[PDB]
Design a protein around this ligand. Structure first.
Ligand SMILES: CC(=O)N[C@@H]1[C@@H](O)[C@H](O[C@@H]2O[C@H](CO)[C@@H](O[C@@H]3O[C@H](CO[C@H]4O[C@H](CO[C@H]5O[C@H](CO)[C@@H](O)[C@H](O)[C@@H]5O)[C@@H](O)[C@H](O[C@H]5O[C@H](CO)[C@@H](O)[C@H](O)[C@@H]5O)[C@@H]4O)[C@@H](O)[C@H](O[C@H]4O[C@H](CO)[C@@H](O)[C@H](O)[C@@H]4O[C@H]4O[C@H](CO)[C@@H](O)[C@H](O)[C@@H]4O)[C@@H]3O)[C@H](O)[C@H]2NC(C)=O)[C@@H](CO)O[C@H]1O
Ligand code: NI
Ligand code: NI
Lengths: 158, 158
């Protein structure tokens, strides 16, 4: 079981960490949503599906930089809404195909009342999301750590 | 990670056991050495070397039959000498190629002062060597057990 991003960055068997740079909506009004859809960037496969099924959760997530300071929001995992930052583990997603299939994570963030000007500086760390893989065969309990970086400024006009 | 012998006998992923039949000096004097070079019999590979590192040790080695009764000895593991029978686990050998590569083990056995006559009966178990595989990714601790059989009698002249 391993995970790849669109831009080529990979975390191999056994887990690890990676830096993912995501393009953001250059401007977001107070009361609009900013969406960070990792389901179109992170894809995971099962390396021996004939005997084993892999179990994937969003174990925990934290906000940093402008997302921490200037945004409230939730995370959507496989169709359900969860608090963000998430302090508790999500239900499991099954992987039993060699075919790259998405990690169904998307952040829904709204600027806060007092937000104004550059609310996310380009190149800054905006979140850390921990993917936890287990299986039905082994004692394997791996963490794939995704450090989420902003590719561009995000402006909240006032 | 799996291991094969020269005559084709194999121990699959997860570990197991095999019989290795070794040719010995038909006659060996007290103070001469009898050498069992396993590096020409046992071969192991790493089944995913690109991301993974396999670690191999001699967990224990034990003497049986005539070798126990009538021989002193040492084992040489990857350039270093250790007593045989073994009093500790050995440092690690790295396996990082899908190509079958030897297990760098050699037994040096010398008949003891009181040794005389037939010291090893052909077909008898003379040693058991436990190869322990680990890795750099999970908690896998697998045992590849090698039962060492004499292909011929050995006589210690008096
Ligand atoms: C004789 C017999 O039957 N013995 C039994 C044995 O077969 C059986 O287990 C399986 O043996 C198969 C024999 O080939 C193995 O298939 C290959 O797996 C490779 C990946 O191996 C690593 O991953 C597995 C699974 O664990 C990871 O993945 C799962 C799945 O998501 C996940 O749950 C885990 O958490 C983890 O992320 C591990 O078991 C392996 O561990 C062993 O080996 C490592 C490395 O030495 C040790 O460190 C470790 O301790 C173990 O000893 C590995 O970590 C795949 O890379 C490989 O893919 C090739 O072949 C398939 C076959 O179709 C292709 O589809 C695929 O594209 C790929 O082909 C490419 O590469 C080939 C050569 O590399 C080449 O020939 C091709 O042309 C092409 O280029 C394949 O899927 C299988 O993994 C073994 N399973 C297990 C669980 O170990 C065991 C199991 O009970 O019993 C024996 O008795
Ligand atoms: Ni793979
Ligand atoms: Ni193999």
């Amino acid at each position: 079981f391993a995970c790849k991003t669109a831009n080529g960055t990979a975390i191999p068997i056994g887990g690890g960490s990676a830096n993912v740079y995501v393009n953001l909506a250059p401007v977001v009004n107070v009361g609009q949503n900013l969406v960070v859809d990792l389901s179109t960037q992170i894809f995971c496969h099962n390396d021996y599906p004939e005997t084993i099924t892999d179990y994937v959760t969003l174990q925990r997530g934290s906000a940093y930089g402008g997302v921490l300071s200037n945004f409230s929001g939730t995370v959507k995992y496989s169709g359900s809404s969860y608090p963000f930052p998430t302090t508790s583990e999500t239900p499991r997603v099954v992987y039993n195909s060699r075919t790259d299939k998405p990690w169904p994570v998307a952040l829904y963030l709204t600027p806060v009342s007092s937000a104004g000007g550059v609310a996310i500086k380009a190149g800054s760390l905006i979140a850390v999301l921990i993917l936890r893989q287990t299986n039905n065969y082994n004692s394997d309990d791996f963490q794939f750590v995704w450090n989420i970086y902003a590719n561009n400024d995000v402006v909240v006009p006032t």
